Amino acid sequence: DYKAFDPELWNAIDAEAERQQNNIELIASENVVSKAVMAAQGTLLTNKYAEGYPGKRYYGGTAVIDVVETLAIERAKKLFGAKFANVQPHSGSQANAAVYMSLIQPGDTVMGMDLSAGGHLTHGAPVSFSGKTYNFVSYNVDKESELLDYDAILAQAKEVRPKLIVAGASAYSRIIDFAKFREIADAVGAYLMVDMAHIAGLVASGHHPSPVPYAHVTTTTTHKTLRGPRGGLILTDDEDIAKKLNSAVFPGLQGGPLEHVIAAKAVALKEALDPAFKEYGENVIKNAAAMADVFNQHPDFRVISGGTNNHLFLVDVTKVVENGKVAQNVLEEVNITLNKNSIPYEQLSPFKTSGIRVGSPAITSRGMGEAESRQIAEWMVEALENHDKPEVLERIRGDVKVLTDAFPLY
Amino acid sequence: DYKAFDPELWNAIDAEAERQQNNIELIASENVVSKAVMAAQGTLLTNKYAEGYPGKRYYGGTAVIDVVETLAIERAKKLFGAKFANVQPHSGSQANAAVYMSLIQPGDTVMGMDLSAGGHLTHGAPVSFSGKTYNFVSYNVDKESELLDYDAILAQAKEVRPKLIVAGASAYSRIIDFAKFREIADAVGAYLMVDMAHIAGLVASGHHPSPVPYAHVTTTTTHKTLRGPRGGLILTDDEDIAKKLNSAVFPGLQGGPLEHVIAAKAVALKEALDPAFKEYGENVIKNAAAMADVFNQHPDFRVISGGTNNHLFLVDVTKVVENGKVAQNVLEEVNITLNKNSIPYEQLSPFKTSGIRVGSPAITSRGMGEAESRQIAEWMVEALENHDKPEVLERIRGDVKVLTDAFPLY
Ligand SMILES: Cc1ncc(COP(=O)(O)O)c(CN[C@H](C(=O)O)[C@@H](C)O)c1O
Ligand SMILES: Cc1ncc(COP(=O)(O)O)c(CN[C@H](C(=O)O)[C@@H](C)O)c1O
Ligand code: NA
Ligand code: NA
């Protein structure tokens, strides 16, 4: 019994397990992983150094690690239909760094989605290595439709002449057209990288068309909709690019991979390969549309782009509260966790924002369905509308507890 | 249960556990972590996004995570006597990247230990981001003594004018004079960074002098001698540098931290604060020295620098077998796993090398003492001397099993 040695730490772990059980987790980038995923991360694979790749390592006694890493790779290939995979990146951010390193040079120009419009930090923020090393020039969404305008993006690319175009987002609710992004890249001789971190589980379930046949390289996190452990993954169909990607991950950016986490990737990928995973995908789509629909009908709330065809959506809350930060703090008091989030053409400070981002994967992984989704959104509307009324929130909190007990986390 | 859903994966996991049990692991960068460390990283903390730092995160639902991360931070500070710590780096390599990003600019000149004399890839190898982004100039050890020669290093630094000197190694066996390194740095107006990855547990146990009072910034892995989960850690006593390092880790290089690994870091740091860790360290030192003495006394092997004052040593094997790769493969035949390794002024190919590197931490963590260590080294000598006598190898392999049976891994 090692927990008696460190009660401060293990009490804190217990408190987080209860926090998670008693919350409605709507943070769009989160999920609830299986016990098998957790168990694999909890193995003595953490003891093993394995610099290199399967069969070409720098240390003895890696033949079993090699089987494990090869399972992950072969499963990623099979699930996503790619000819090559690298399962070593420690995160989505490292995965993306490796692609840039493989395809372009410092100072080269890159187009990626504007951060207010849902692009990631590693898609060119000035405070990220991405913006510091490469010349990123952002494309945006249409100001009226809040949709990607492929003609506008094509004309911009024709002016900019990037070496690389990055597609993918952290907060865009609509289907991204990867065929068009590749047309656009081809029109200027650019590579196309798709960062499908947020939608990888939908791509896997068949609810979002795949970037894989269109992107020269596809990156993703394994956590998020794919419902795996925290880490990165890189896919391509080009063998020469694959070799570069491999050198870039190691020795380029990383040292020894986290082979216990890689085992957990293999676990998650086999889960996503199972027919049940499609049904999970299907519910993710439905649950998010149901919550979105509630806000759509309510007159003091607008939903960015008018709705969603994926797992997430953004809501402008400024009619009802001052900003997204506030909205987040309030929903938190009724045990509903999400995050504030800039909306396209955000007017307010980055640290306030005008919006909230909502996602369905975690509640869907707990077994909730359309009715519960709808109710959760009613509750959010209701709490925001009564934010100054402690008696209302206290009641909403009570009702939330009935729902969380009914769909227990583990 | 979940193992039945995925037998190919769980069969491999179970096989690695057994392989670790049935091999004598002398790889100097490995250790055997506690069940607690592994359990921490097998928790549902993996489901939480926690970009930012305690109390200044970009998501709600982070109050307990803050408790965990803060425990990790305060325990690092305490254990190493530092005023600031950052526990988010995913790896040692990422820790190092962050520090360069914080202290210097692309193209700046940096001095780093030579890869053949024990410097790490991230200390300036042309295949690493380190050598690609910065102008690294290497220093070596003295050709005759195989020791750091602080006068030569100073003369070189005066010629080269680095903005940063990096100290620390993957394969140096003697005590490093950090006060001397800082004196050199101060003399040329350079920063000093110390990468204490290999030695951090010995710094913690009291058996290696701390670089913390002398380096502007100290990096380390939490795995290796410290006996923690895989990951990185950064320390400094300078508040302005600490702000830079934090911004460099996130949003500079990483995104979301691995909070389950961070819990595991907290676990390991408390283990290392326990008085028993001092005894572990002492055994690490005695066991490595007992192994080295066998090779010192044998006339056909030479230990680099004539011995060790830490957890590791290198042996020139070229009088008995052709190169280090051969020696590595021979030992593997008798279930002793190590790695071939360049020696200082290496004349053979990097793929072959003249050396093997041996370390004590793993066997020490299984509870082996001096007599077992000495016996292990005798078997290594005997295996290499009889590498073409299958019958001898077979007998050694059988003796090894008796020993491993007697010191169960967990
Ligand atoms: C599209 C995308 N790519 C890559 C990453 C980085 O992966 P990490 O380095 O493993 O964290 C994220 C994280 N997305 C966060 C999120 O969506 O909650 C975002 C706000 O910064 C992402 O949304
Ligand atoms: C001194 C030093 N710093 C940093 C690292 C990076 O750590 P990672 O990114 O967490 O793997 C290592 C790994 N050391 C290996 C080893 O010694 O076995 C080395 C030779 O490549 C190291 O020895
Ligand atoms: Na509305
Ligand atoms: Na000798």
Question: If you write DSSP's letter for every residue of A142-187 in order, what string do you get?
Answer: -TTT-S--HHHHHHHHHHH--SEEEE--SS--SPP-HHHHHHHHHH
Tell me whether strands A164-167 and A109-113 are parallel, antiparallel or unpaired: parallel
**Distance, CA of B164 to CA of B321 (rounded, Å):** 40
By C-alpha distance, which of B319, B317, B322, B323 is closest to B380?
A: B317
**Distance, CA of B357 to CA of A141 (rounded, Å):** 56
Helix (H, G, I), strand (E, B), or coil: what is residue A55?
A: coil
By C-alpha distance, which of B166, B160, B158 is closest to B188?
A: B158
Question: Which residues pair with residue A110 across a beta bridge?
Answer: A136, A164
Phi, psi (rounded to 5 degrees) for A156: -60, -45
Report the nearest-CA residue for atom 3 of ligand 1: A197
Query: Residues B243-254, buried b or exposed e (16+ Cβ, 10 A)?
Result: ebbbbbbbbbbb
List residues, by chain if needed, whose CB lies under 5 Å from ion ligand 3: A 296, 298, 301
Within 8 A by CB and 6+ apart from A245, the residues are A84, A86, A98, A99, A102, A217, A234, A236
Mutational pocket test of ligand 2: of B88, B170, B226, B337, the residue with most ligand atoms within 8 Å of the beta carbon: B170
Contacts by B49-53 with C-beta closer than 8 Å and gap 24+?
B49/A27, B49/A29, B49/A30, B49/B256, B50/B256, B50/B257, B50/B259, B51/B250, B51/B251, B51/B255, B51/B256, B51/B257, B52/B250, B53/B246, B53/B250
Q: What angle do CA B378, B383, B389 make, to 5 degrees?
A: 140
Q: Is B32 on the interface with A (CB under 8 A)?
A: yes
By C-alpha distance, which of B326, B340, B341, B342 is closest to B384?
A: B326
**Distance, CA of A193 to CA of B132 (rounded, Å):** 23
Count CB-CB contacts under 10 A for residue A156: 17
| The residue type at A77 | K
Q: Is B71 on the interface with A (CB under 8 A)?
A: yes
**Distance, CA of A89 to CA of A97 (rounded, Å):** 10
Contact between A409 and A27 under an 8 Å Cβ cutoff? The reply is: no
B339 and A58 in contact by Cβ < 8 A?
yes
Mutational pocket test of ligand 1: of A100, A120, A121, the residue with most ligand atoms within 8 Å of the beta carbon: A120
Residue recorded with tokens 């007599």: B371
Count CB-CB contacts under 10 A for residue B119: 27
By C-alpha distance, which of A39, A201, A153 is closest to B17?
A: A39
By C-alpha distance, which of A229, A234, A238, A264 is closest to A252?
A: A234
Which-ligand-closest: CA of B292?
A: 4
Residue recorded with tokens 């390599």: B93
CA distances from A32 to A259, A331, B41, B158 (A): 21, 20, 15, 56
Within 8 A by CB and 6+ apart from A144, the residues are none
Within 8 A by CB and 6+ apart from B89, the residues are B95, B98, B219, B231, B232, B233, B234, B249, B254
CA A84 to chain centre: 21
Min Cα separation B355/chain A (Å) = 13
Q: Which residues of B are documented as binding site for (6S)-5,6,7,8-tetrahydrofolate?
A: 115, 119-121, 349-351
Count CB-CB contacts under 10 A for residue A375: 18
In angstroms, this model's resolution equals 2.0
Would you list the DSSP string of A8-51? HHHHHHHHHHHHHHTSEE--TT-----HHHHHHHTSGGGG----
By C-alpha distance, which of B36, B27, B23 is closest to B409?
A: B23
**Distance, CA of A88 to CA of A327 (rounded, Å):** 37
User: What is the maximum span of chain A, computed from C-alpha positions, in angstroms?
Assistant: 65
| Nearest-by-Cβ selection for B49 from A30, A270, A332 | A30
**Distance, CA of B185 to CA of B165 (rounded, Å):** 7
**Distance, CA of B286 to CA of B283 (rounded, Å):** 5
Contact between B201 and B362 under an 8 Å Cβ cutoff? The reply is: no
Sign of CA dihedral B48, B51, B56, B60: negative
Contact between A338 and A331 under an 8 Å Cβ cutoff? The reply is: yes
Instruction: Report residue B372 as tokens.
Output: 């077992």
CA distances from B70 to A9, B56, B58, B83, B91 (A): 10, 12, 17, 13, 19
- Considering only the top CATH level, what class is B37-273? alpha beta
User: What separation, in Å, do the N-terminal and C-terminal C-alpha atoms of chain B show?
Assistant: 23
**Distance, CA of B221 to CA of B229 (rounded, Å):** 9
Query: Residues A217-241, buried b or exposed e (16+ Cβ, 10 A)?
Result: bbbbbbbbbbbbbbbbbbbbbeeeb
By C-alpha distance, which of A158, A173, A90, A166 is closest to A135?
A: A166
Count CB-CB contacts under 10 A for residue A406: 11
B residues 103-162 lying closer than 8 A (beta carbon) to A: 106, 120-122, 125, 127-129, 132-133
Contact between B52 and A21 under an 8 Å Cβ cutoff? The reply is: no
Contact between B223 and B230 under an 8 Å Cβ cutoff? The reply is: yes
| The residue type at B39 | A
Helix (H, G, I), strand (E, B), or coil: what is residue B195?
A: strand
Residue recorded with tokens 């005590």: B175
Query: Residues B176-204, buried b or exposed e (16+ Cβ, 10 A)?
Result: bebebbbebbeebebbbbbbbbbbbbbbb
Helix (H, G, I), strand (E, B), or coil: what is residue A294?
A: helix
Min Cα separation B90/chain A (Å) = 7
Report the nearest-CA residue for atom 20 of ligand 1: A170
**Distance, CA of B176 to CA of B158 (rounded, Å):** 20
